[PDB]
Parathion hydrolase (Brevundimonas diminuta), 666 residues
Amino acid sequence: DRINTVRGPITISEAGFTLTHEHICGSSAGFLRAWPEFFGSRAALVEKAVRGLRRARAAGVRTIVDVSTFDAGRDVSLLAEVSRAADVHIVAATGLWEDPPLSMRLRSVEELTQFFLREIQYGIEDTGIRAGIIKVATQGKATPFQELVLRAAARASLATGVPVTTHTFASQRDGEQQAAIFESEGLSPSRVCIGHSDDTDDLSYLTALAARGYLIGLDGIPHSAIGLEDNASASALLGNRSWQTRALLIKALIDQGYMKQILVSNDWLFGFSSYVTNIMDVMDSVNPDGMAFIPLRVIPFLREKGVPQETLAGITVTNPARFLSPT
Amino acid sequence: ISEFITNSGDRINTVRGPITISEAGFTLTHEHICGSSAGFLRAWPEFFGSRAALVEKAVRGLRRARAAGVRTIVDVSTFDAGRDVSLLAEVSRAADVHIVAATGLWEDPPLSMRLRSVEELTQFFLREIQYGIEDTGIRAGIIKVATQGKATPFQELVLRAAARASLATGVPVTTHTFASQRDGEQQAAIFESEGLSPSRVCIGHSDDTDDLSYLTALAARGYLIGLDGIPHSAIGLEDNASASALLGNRSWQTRALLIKALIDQGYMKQILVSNDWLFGFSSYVTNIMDVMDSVNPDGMAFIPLRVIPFLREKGVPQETLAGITVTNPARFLSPTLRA
Ligand SMILES: CC1CC(O)(O)CC(O)(O)C1
Ligand SMILES: [Zn+2]
Ligand SMILES: [Zn+2]
Ligand SMILES: [Zn+2]
Ligand SMILES: [Zn+2]
């Protein structure tokens, strides 16, 4: 019936148009509190995120899923503040991303399961805010620790019904190994979104996963360093494929019959400290629409390609609701 | 005369505010309340039982050290070692033991630090010394840095940023070494290329090595020698591989006799001693704090209760031991003039 957000539980019908892979701030544990001047100030970051989320709201977005984990610097009090002041629901995440500190990397699968369950069932830190999704990551073949995280995420999902969403190196087909580990724990593919799947052009990789029941996260549509070819760091992070190429993978999976399993997002942020210093300004300079890019640019592009309204509403409303509802 | 006056004079920053140099007293220069990771104590306090259990454990431990004569500890936990200065302030008030907090970076920096330039790191260290840590207003009184063998390129940047922050603020620098790889020599070279005075640098974990020529060469150059892990020993724990790997096979007596050896060779003024103890420990294996507590129940009181009597009956005068534990830290922690 209910999805946990940073403002409390909401009914499934209240989620509406939902972006399923977003960030208020991509950082590191403790960093925003220790060095807020990196972002100008905490107050400036709040103002920027509220302005950006209000723009997405005006474009039709009603909910975002912030898939920042502990080690990506999730500050759930920031999420709550920005959610309240933009009147946009925010679902918070547990799990671990690609930068776990020693106090996490030394933990057993049983210990990690307890930590994920704490954030889902009890709350994050001392805030009482409960996570509504579990985030995990690989970058190619899983490290031994990442195998533990994937298993703990599966166990936490089985205990609570909250879904699992993943970071992949899509061009190394990471979703296949993630799926194998999840299924070895008894997790239903319908509880799993294989993310960053628009980073690859290998449609056969994506359709094979979708034919097994997985959700496919086409979540980085505006990420492109076209026009930034003299910028090595932006090119390495954003890639040289266009947003149109990424968006046409949405149409391709629709055309192949998988509209009920597509999840679309921007993978945008309003602050970004875990990469080179200038990256947030560079990213903003090529996508000023920010999180409004999906509703303002991708939807009109697909509609004029012939995707009907019912299909676009199915992808942006029905699929996230089915995914997020604890099952 | 001025050794006796506590109601006025120059001051050092603690988690409870500024104190005069004379108030510092018996000072342990390398300790931890909790060895963790950034944000970890707040995200998963049940790892330590509870935050309140950790507080009570630390307060009892500090009171034990205080009854043994300790008046001040330097908590050399950085941001990435999970320093929680609000925890430090709470336990300092409850135990009435002064705590100096640290800036710098240790061996587990996150991406948001690893990607930063020397200039950016300099600004972060200056923020924590000149403005305060997080939103607490508590100012760091020492800069902590680390190598584990030959420095990585990032570790070099950290050492240079530490030196620049030290010159700009007057606060001293203290280091983590892999002592058997002679890390202090490369650290010294980098520090000296930045113009930092050796008398403002403690080369830490120096009791992990038996190579006296390495230590006396650094002390002869004016460096402070941190003999800071005296009770760390896995003797009796040989079937415990994780405890053996962390604590080593050398006895506390062997470590303590390095203190006497440096005294005997004329380097008393260059020695700093400590326990490198903690009351919570999450950045290693799960059982490690209970294991460590089982072989050193005295905790931070090990230096006053065990090392001082051992050295005294070996003929080290009381006044020499008081110079090492009171005067030497006072000179180290007292800020010098800014550049
Ligand atoms: C925090 C984000 C930054 C990014 O560049 O969008 C990649 C990511 O893996 O989604 C994590
Ligand atoms: Zn990702
Ligand atoms: Zn992301
Ligand atoms: Zn150390
Ligand atoms: Zn230490």
Observations:
- Chain B touches chain A through 34 residues (CB under 8 Å).
